[PDB]
Design brief:
Chain lengths: 62, 42
C-alpha cells in the first residue's frame, strides 16, 4: 500500500527526468564542441576567432 | 482427568486442535495515516 518509501520513489522518478534532461543537454553541448574542434580551428579572421571563443565561453558557462 | 488437567495435557490438545490447525492466524492509533491523504500526494 501507499507508504513513505513509495512517495520517495515517485518523487525521485519525477526528479530523474530533470537529470536526464541535464545529461542530454551536456551531450548536445559537447557534440557542438566537437563540431567546433574537429572542424578546422583556423582563426585567421579576427571576427571568426572572436565568435568561436565566445561560443566556447558561453557553452562552458552554461 | 484431573491429573491430565494439572499436567497441562488438555490445554495443549485444545491449542493443537483449535489453533495449531486453524486456517487463520494466531492473533491501535487514531493518528491520521498516510492512506487517508494519499490522493493529495498523488
Amino acid at each position: 500500500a501507499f507508504t513513505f518509501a513509495a512517495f520517495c520513489y515517485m518523487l525521485t522518478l519525477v526528479l530523474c527526468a530533470s537529470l536526464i534532461f541535464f545529461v542530454i543537454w551536456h551531450i548536445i553541448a559537447f557534440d557542438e564542441l566537437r563540431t567546433d574542434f574537429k572542424n578546422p580551428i583556423d582563426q585567421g579572421n579576427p571576427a571568426r576567432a572572436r565568435e568561436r571563443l565566445k561560443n566556447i565561453e558561453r557553452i562552458c558557462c552554461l | 482427568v484431573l491429573k491430565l488437567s494439572e499436567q497441562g495435557v488438555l490445554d495443549k490438545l485444545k491449542s493443537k486442535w483449535w489453533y495449531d490447525k486453524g486456517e487463520c492466524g494466531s492473533k491501535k492509533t487514531s493518528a491520521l495515516s498516510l492512506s487517508n491523504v494519499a490522493g493529495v500526494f498523488y
